[PDB]
């Protein structure tokens, strides 16, 4: 159904140890496709997916020029933000940036966004209308007054609606076998006795895509989402994801409990039980 | 594809 393209940028100062470290990465949905690293030997935007490699020399030269311009801009932003917040030269600080666009089932423009962060907290963010900003504090309003004067929102809105979507559409067609696939989760349950009284029932879900998944537990019909040990949806390493949810149960009452699983690739949601 | 960006904070 819905899809998205997003670029993530990180810039970290290393005072008296060369230039700031700059890492940029591009995603389509939950599949990474490009990267750039300022410490790497190549000094180029490199491919991190099979389907992007078919792009000619003009694409890669163009992306290298643009990502180099990002790198050098966020280098200045570090110096600017240090002066804004009145911090010492020797201290290390972080600048994070994210932008991109979403699309619906029809591949039309759903929404866009463009956000900044300094030392973990939110700095400045483009609102959903793409014509106005949200300033976190004193310093963010200084940047807001500059960017309202420079008509930056009008420039970003044109990209996010126009260009961002056209490239997202084009990547989805290029990597049809990778991006538009939908791998179903391979589920199974496992039993482990904690004590004479207690017993744990873990409900797995392996090798699925995309990462959006729901694993809830029920005690004979009704939900009991409290006392359910969830974990982060973690990457397997080969493109697919993993997740599990565990519950503590009295010994000899395992078949009362059931694990409900919901996923895009699943036509109907699976209901698991202990053997 | 990246947008061409030089605009500073």
């Amino acid at each position: 159904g819905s899809h998205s393209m997003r670029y993530f940028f990180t810039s970290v100062s290393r005072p008296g140890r060369g230039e700031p470290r700059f890492i940029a990465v591009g995603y389509v949905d939950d599949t990474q496709f490009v990267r750039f690293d300022s410490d790497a030997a190549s000094q180029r935007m490199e491919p991190r997916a099979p389907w992007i490699e078919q792009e000619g020399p003009e694409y890669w030269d163009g992306e290298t020029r643009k990502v180099k311009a990002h790198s050098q801009t966020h280098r200045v932003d570090l110096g600017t933000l240090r002066g804004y917040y009145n911090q010492s030269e020797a201290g290390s600080h972080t600048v994070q940036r994210m932008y991109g666009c979403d699309v619906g089932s029809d591949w039309r423009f759903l929404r866009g966004y463009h956000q900044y962060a300094y030392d973990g907290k939110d700095y400045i963010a483009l609102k959903e209308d793409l014509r106005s900003w949200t300033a976190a504090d004193m310093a963010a309003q200084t940047t807001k007054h500059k960017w309202e004067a420079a008509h930056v929102a009008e420039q970003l809105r044109a990209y996010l609606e126009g260009t961002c979507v056209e490239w997202l559409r084009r990547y989805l067609e290029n990597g049809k076998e990778t991006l538009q696939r939908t791998d179903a989760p391979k589920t199974h349950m496992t039993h482990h006795a904690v004590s004479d009284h207690e017993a744990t029932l873990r409900c797995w879900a392996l090798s699925f895509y995309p990462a959006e998944i729901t694993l809830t537990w029920q005690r004979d019909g009704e939900d009991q989402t409290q006392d359910t040990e969830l974990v982060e949806t973690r990457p397997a390493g080969d493109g697919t994801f993993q997740k599990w949810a565990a519950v503590v149960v009295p010994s000899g009452q395992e078949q009362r409990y059931t694990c409900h699983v919901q996923h895009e690739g699943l036509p109907k949601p699976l209901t698991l039980r202990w053997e | 594809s990246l947008l061409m960006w030089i605009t500073q904070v």
Partner: T-cell receptor
């Protein structure tokens, strides 16, 4: 960025009309430069919003639907005799394009 | 500095020698563009820089032409093995102080004449 074919001759005190079309519909900022004989180009006006922009005797007009810009010199003096250059950019960080230029001579 | 400053203003060169045209832009201007302007024509695009990195080299007429901007400020257009047809008015220009979009501020120019 294709500009109108020079030269152009206009009487003193008359309205001079300069036009310029462009292919790239994604161009954001538009400019009108003026270049005297053996001098560098200097800026007269800038425009990005549609419709008219007045600055004294000069009046620029952008029509981004029909994709052209134009400069209107009202009550033109001999000191306006120059080669008028149209210029545009797709945005900050991109190339800065120029038209071929129209050679205006205001007949005294 | 205050405005853009090229050097030299005028230059005579023997046919076959190399030349280096200097361009000192306005302080803090990110973009720096190069042009050549033939007699009674508009500025033809050559190349430009963002910060330090030369962007597209396509506008440079042939491989004898080359340009750098090593420390992200002063640029230097370099023509090797000059020919009579290289003679032109070479202008540079800077823009975008602190990255915000502005007009292109022009330098005084370099009148290059390649004599046989």
């Amino acid at each position: 960025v294709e500009q109108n074919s020079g030269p152009l001759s206009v009487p003193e005190g008359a309205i001079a009309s300069l036009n310029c079309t462009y292919s790239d519909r994604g161009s954001q900022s538009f400019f009108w430069y003026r270049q005297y004989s053996g001098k560098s180009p200097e800026l007269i006006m800038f425009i990005y919003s549609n419709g008219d922009k007045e600055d004294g005797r000069f009046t620029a007009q952008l029509n981004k639907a029909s994709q052209y810009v134009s400069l209107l010199i009202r009550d033109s003096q001999p000191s306006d005799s120059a080669t008028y250059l149209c210029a545009l950019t797709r945005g900050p960080g991109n190339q800065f394009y120029f038209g071929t230029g129209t050679s205006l001579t205001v007949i005294p | 500095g205050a405005g853009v400053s090229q050097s030299p203003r005028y230059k005579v060169t023997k046919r076959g020698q190399d030349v280096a045209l200097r361009c000192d832009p306005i302080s803090g201007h990110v973009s720096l563009y190069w042009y050549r302007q033939a007699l009674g024509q508009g500025p033809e695009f050559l190349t430009y820089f963002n910060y330090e990195a030369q962007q597209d080299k396509s506008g440079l007429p042939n491989d004898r032409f080359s340009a750098e901007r090593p420390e992200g400020s002063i640029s230097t257009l370099t023509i090797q093995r000059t020919e009579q047809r290289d003679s032109a008015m070479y202008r540079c220009a800077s823009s975008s102080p602190g990255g915000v979009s502005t007009e292109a501020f022009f330098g005084q120019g370099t009148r290059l004449t390649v004599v046989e």
